[PDB]
Amino acid sequence: VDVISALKAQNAQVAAGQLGGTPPVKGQQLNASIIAQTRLTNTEEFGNIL
Amino acid sequence: MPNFFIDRPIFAWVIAIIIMLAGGLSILKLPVAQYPTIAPPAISITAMYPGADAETVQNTVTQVIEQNMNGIDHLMYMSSNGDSTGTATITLTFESGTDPDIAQVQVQNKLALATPLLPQEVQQQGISVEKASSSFLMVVGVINTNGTMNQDDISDYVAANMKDPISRTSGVGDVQLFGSQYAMRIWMDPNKLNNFQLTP
Amino acid sequence: GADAETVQNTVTQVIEQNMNGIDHLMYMSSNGDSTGTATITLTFESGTDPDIAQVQVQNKLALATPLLPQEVQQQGISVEKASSSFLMVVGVINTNGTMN
Amino acid sequence: GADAETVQNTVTQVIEQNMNGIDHLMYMSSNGDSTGTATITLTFESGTDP
Amino acid sequence: AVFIPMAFFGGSTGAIYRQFSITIVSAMALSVLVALILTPALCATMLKPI
Amino acid sequence: DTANAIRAELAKMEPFFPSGMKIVYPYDTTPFVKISIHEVVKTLVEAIILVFLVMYLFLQNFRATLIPTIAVPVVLLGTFAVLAAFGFSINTLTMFGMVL
Amino acid sequence: GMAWLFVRLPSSFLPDEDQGVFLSMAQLPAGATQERTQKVLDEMTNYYLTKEKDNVESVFAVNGFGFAGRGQNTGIAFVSLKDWSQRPGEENKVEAITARAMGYFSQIKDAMVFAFNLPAIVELGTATGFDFELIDQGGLGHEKLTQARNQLFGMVAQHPDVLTGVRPNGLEDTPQFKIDIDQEKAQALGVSISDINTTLGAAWGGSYVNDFIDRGRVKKVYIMSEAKYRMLPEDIGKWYVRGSDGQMVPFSAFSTSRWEYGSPRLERYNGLPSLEILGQAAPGKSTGEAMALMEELAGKLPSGIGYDWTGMSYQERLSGNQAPALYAISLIVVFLCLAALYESWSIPFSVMLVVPLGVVGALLAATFRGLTNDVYFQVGLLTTIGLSAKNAILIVEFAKDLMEKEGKGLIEATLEAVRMRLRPILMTSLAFILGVMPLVISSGAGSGAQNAVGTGVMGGMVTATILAIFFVPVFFVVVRRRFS
Amino acid sequence: LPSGIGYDWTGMSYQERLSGNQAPALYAISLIVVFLCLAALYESWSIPFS
Amino acid sequence: AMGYFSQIKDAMVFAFNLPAIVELGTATGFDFELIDQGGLGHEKLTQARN
Amino acid sequence: GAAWGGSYVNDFIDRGRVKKVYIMSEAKYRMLPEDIGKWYVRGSDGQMVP
């Protein structure tokens, strides 16, 4: 059960929005999407799960 | 034959008058349009992967869906795009003369076959199969001459009172609202949350 | 267990706000009663293919389903291309009178 | 990782009970095996559009 | 010409009148076809000279 | 037809608008369709007039020239009947065909 | 001469029309904000409502929404012109109006602004011109493909005499903000990863929590940070998440940030990564010439980079490819009908020898008026085939009858037929010519299509009358002598 | 009724509003066509009236 | 039955016969939906109905 | 909800067929407004609070 819980928690997707997203502050000039993808790809990352 | 009607002019007149009468009656009922149905039918598949970059969308959803979509009858060409917002749009253009309803049914079947391979996140959102168009037939704008309502109020009134009845009008394929419906916006302040030791 | 108000505001409005883009849709009516059942009926123009109409309605409902409460989904949403009047009623009687 | 009885009682019976309202249906048959696979086959009339 | 136009009734009742129109028109067409070819052949043979 | 239905629906909506609200039409391709159909019909009648004059030039007699002109409405209306029979519509392409 | 003219005649699919409306768009550089787009849209609207106030009725600018690609750096404007009656002359038409607009819009220096006319088949595409699809067939990768596209634009800019207003139909690569969540540090500080993800998402991208009832209507409920805490990379540190110990810990403690550049909208065409290119032919050039030049230019691109046409260009290429078959089949069908009707093989050959006489006139008519080889012209060519064959019939059939029924000689019968049937031929020919005369001289709303339909077939009639009235006797006499 | 309270017709009421009674026009067309057929039959414009 | 039921029964009892075409109800009947366009609420809609 | 409206927990097999399982208050305890006070909920401390 603990292994299942850890594995479910480790991989996910984050809708991190954007810098300067709408509604923006007056005078904003940079709009960049925020990417925070803490995803695990190879075997060692899975093995490294706490 | 010409001699028969030479001797019988009233017969020929009757034939001509009957043809003309049928023509006028047909004119009364005939529809009028600029062009007949010329453009090839198109079917759109829209799926959302919330908070996924464009590269992730292409690899995870669009590639999987496109691979299965190959082989449908009377398929002319496909196109796709994966936005940074996570939306994936697969547009399938079929050969002219194809019945769009059967095309939609077949596309739905293939999408059902390909759905389990998709990420669970995009399965929760729900994928849409709809007949698609490219250009707006009409744009109807709403203004407030009194200069009392901003864009939010006008847009909310439209979304609440005009979008749906038009969306269900006969022949209206799709309606896009150039605004946004009202929503209960809660604007958090990180300083206050931290002061009260709360999190979103 | 949901009353009429809950049924409307949690199921019927959610479903009917996504019932757009369907072809040959004459009019749409829906009602929710105290027994907890929501009934949305979409009438189509004469000559409309019932199978295609059901397919399109089902597509829109599939879009609108995940927003519904879990209990509603578990009970099982049903889409039927049926008439209004009963074709026939097949009653069943126990002549012995032993059963209930 | 499910047996035949589990597969039947939890998948096949439910699907069969909710397979109502389809047109031109001749018969349906189904099975569940030790591997965990439920296969439900619906056979339609000859003229039916697949 | 008497019965054809009632086929083109509009509205919901249009099919109702179309049934009668098609039935009677087809019946008349078959009737005149029979009277043109079938009946004259029968009259020659069956009718004993009077 | 969809444009007319939309305009009728907007006409129905208008009475319930709050004070000051106004519907504008900043973009619409239907007026072009209507004007183009009007133009092609004008071209058709001009063609009929021109054809009449050409025959009258050679025939040099009204009754003689009237005979081929009678063949125009009968053929055109028969063509409209044929279009109705096979489900075709009155579009600029059929109008061009008739003009030819 | 007919072959030479047909080879040199430019091709196109359907003529553009003045539908009373046209579109516009603005593509600010990547990473542009909504306000900078709104300023550009205001400049466009001001131009429309001041420099073109006599022709432009209203402008409906939509910020943040584009025909292809939706983002803060895009925007479109639907421009509706005055009534056709209020705009007289060629200067007050969509072609000239958009030409004048592009002259001003090419000096914006802040964005890529385009004004374009609607396509004839509005359902097929969003704009007039062509739909080029640069395709990465060799798996080169996105970076190579954009490099290939940039080179293609470099080639295109060298031919402004043919291609004009050539633009991508996508979004350029944008800066992206990457946040590295060092999960081990979060665990050390006692903070759940789920809390981190939820806090970040709800703070910076909003979160649709649930619904609420607003005046009896089901509307959404969103939570998002206030604007001033959601603007800078520094604002990451302002957001605190509660640890298991109950001590708030800032995002700066367990995360780092870095800038990357990735595409916001990736495209695929027929299962291969692709970049869509839109463009128009320069004034005085047809779509066919532009498409030919585009194919030639795409030939010189590096290997592994293919191409394909879609939409209107696909249909145009299909029309060009299927035409010759249509012509051949139509000629064969006409020949067979003539053979069946006249019970001969000599008569049909003599009649079919007349088709070039009408075709050369049809081609000359289009060449003189500067029209192109559209679908309408193709229809006209078929009509000219019919008309020339009709005149040949009017002579030959009467000539044939005299040779059989009256037993006259070959030359005598031909002379008699040419003498007697002259007047009906001229009557029918002039009737047709004046019949399509209103199409040719039309100048109004649908004048683009009407001229295309009428011009080609009108000249075909005049040559199938003038030339055939002399050449048909030659064809009939020559064929009959050889009994071929 | 007070402001904001619309109305609409459904069911049969809806179906009747769309359907227009074309019967007089259809019968007029029938009479005209029958007269034309009779004129063709007798080769006279007057005899049909009988 | 209506005479017997309506006179005596405290509740509203309706004995009736289905029409020839079930969809087309009573020839004199009509269905009249009273729509709350302005979002007034159920109470105001009921008052308008009264 | 479970007391006064019944709750569908899961399924069970009855004579081979899958049938639902419901929990609900016994009829006599959900009939009157006063029956609300009979129902108790357990707090965090473990005490039943009405």
Residue numbers in the entry:
A (entry chain A): 201 to 250
B (entry chain B): 1 to 200
C (entry chain C): 51 to 150
D (entry chain A): 51 to 100
E (entry chain C): 451 to 500
F (entry chain B): 301 to 400
G (entry chain B): 550 to 1033
H (entry chain C): 850 to 899
In the authors' words:
The K. pneumoniae AcrB (KpAcrB) multidrug efflux pump belongs to the resistance-nodulation-cell division (RND) superfamily of efflux transporters. This inner membrane efflux pump assembles with the KpAcrA periplasmic adaptor protein and the KpTolC outer membrane channel to form a tripartite efflux complex that spans the entire cell envelope to directly extrude drugs out of K. pneumoniae cells. KpAcrB adopts the overall fold of hydrophobe-amphiphile efflux (HAE)-RND-type proteins and forms a homotrimer.
The MST analysis indicates that the equilibrium dissociation constant (KD) for KpAcrB and Ery interaction is 14.4 ± 2.6 μM. After confirming that KpAcrB specifically interacts with Ery, we incubated 10 μM KpAcrB-nanodisc sample with 500 μM Ery for 2 h to form the KpAcrB-Ery complex. We then solved the cryo-EM structure of this complex to a resolution of 2.96 Å. The overall structure of KpAcrB-Ery is very similar to that of apo-KpAcrB. Superimposition of the apo-KpAcrB and KpAcrB-Ery trimers gives rise to an overall root-mean-square deviation (r.m.s.d.) of 0.36 Å. In comparison with the structure of apo-KpAcrB, the conformation of KpAcrB-Ery is distinct in that the three protomers are in the forms of “extrusion,” “binding,” and “access,” respectively (in a clockwise direction as shown Fig. 2D) instead of “extrusion,” “access,” and “binding” conformations (in a clockwise direction) as shown in the apo-KpAcrB trimer structure. Within the “binding” protomer of KpAcrB-Ery, we discovered a large extra density corresponding to the bound Ery macrolide. This Ery molecule is located deep inside the distal drug-binding site of the KpAcrB pump. No extra densities were seen in the periplasmic clefts of the “access” and “extrusion” protomers, suggesting that only the “binding” protomer is occupied by Ery. There are six aromatic and hydrophobic residues, including F136, F178, Y327, F614, F616, and L667, involved in anchoring this drug. How Ery binds in KpAcrB is very distinct from the interactions observed in EcAcrB but quite similar to the mode of Ery binding in the N. gonorrhoeae MtrD pump, where MtrD was found to house Ery in the distal drug-binding site with aromatic residues F136, F176, Y325, F568, F610, F612, and F625 responsible for binding.
